[model samples]
Target: QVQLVESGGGLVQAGGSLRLSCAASRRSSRSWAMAWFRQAPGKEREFVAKISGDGRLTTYGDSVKGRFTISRDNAEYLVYLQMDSLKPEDTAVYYCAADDNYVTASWRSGPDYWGQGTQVTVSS
Candidate 1:
């Protein structure tokens, strides 16, 4: 079976950087691209970025720019996301998703085919 596992940790003192990892196994890394989403408190989940197998990437929304980076190591069959300038409001569940299509245009056509969500907490 295919699975995605996310792991990372950091302490938030006043303000600091936060990094997270999304690793997938039992699948071909070239077949799908990984995506990162941010689900903040009392707010809906928002798209952050999509990293293709070829290293092409796209970021959605305005509030999440330059603060996020996505990378994948095909040798290890893993994908990772690094986020910076974290705040208390940044505490939320971050998910790594796999897009089945080459060009993801619609949610119906392309969904989070695989995921392993990680909850990040930033506090004083």
Candidate 2:
């Protein structure tokens, strides 16, 4: 069984920062990559970043290049995403997904399991 759960604040202020977490559990022996995404109110989902299974490779989207960071703790089965210098436009629902292709050398694949998501509201 593979599962993912997201946890974070529900509200944030403009110019503030926040850290979100994703906890994962996998019963199989397959390596996986964790991905983070954001969906603005009534908008499409946008990819933020992903941390490879070995916790060495990290890739970020062009939009979140400097403000978003992705990291993982294999010992705790936890993945984290930190965002800084936020704006009102950053208010969105954040989700974490797990990709099961990490062991095959193709880590740039779609998510196999998704977290429940954390709704974030940025205001003044």
Candidate 3:
């Protein structure tokens, strides 16, 4: 079975930045796709970004266009998200999803498994 784990700081100050991580397991690094998402309190999930397994193609959501970056470390089978100039409204839970057979650029079917999610709180 494929698995994903998300890690990052639980608290971040407004205007500050944080780097979140998502590690994948049980799959070949060359044949998978990873995506990140964020959900504000009492709100639906929002797409953040996605990176192809080979680390060549990437796409970001319109809402997080400028402040969010998505990258992958193929050597470690990990995905990273760097968010800068955070605001209080950014407080939310972030998640990572994985598709073992992701070949197309578009996200066809949703991920088979989802990480527990990393909760981020923006204050000050």
Q: What's the lDDT for all of these models?
A: 0.69, 0.79, 0.81
Question: Model 2, 1-124: lDDT tens per residue?
Answer: 4688899858888888999998887534126877888888678888888888878988887877899888888878888999898888888888888776543222324777778889889897
Better of 2 and 3 by lDDT: 3
Superposed by TM-score, candidate 2 places the C-alpha of residue 41 at a distance from the truth, in angstroms, of: 3.4
Ranking by TM-score: 3, 2, 1
- lDDT of candidate 3 over 1-124, digit per residue (tens): 6688999859988999999999887557547788887888789787788888888888887877899899988778888999999888788899888866454322535777788999999997
Candidate 3 versus the native: TM-score?
A: 0.87
The local lDDT score (0 to 100) that residue 29 gets in candidate 1 is 59
Clashing pairs in 3: none
lDDT of candidate 3 at residue 68, scale 0 to 100: 87
Index of the highest-lDDT prediction = 3
> Candidate 3's C-alpha lDDT?
0.81
lDDT of 2 at 30: 29
Can you give the lDDT of residue 10 in candidate 3? 90
Residue-pair clash count for candidate 3: 0
Number of colliding residue pairs in each model:
0, 0, 0
On a 0 to 1 TM-score scale, where does candidate 2 land against the true structure?
0.86
Clashing pairs in 2: none
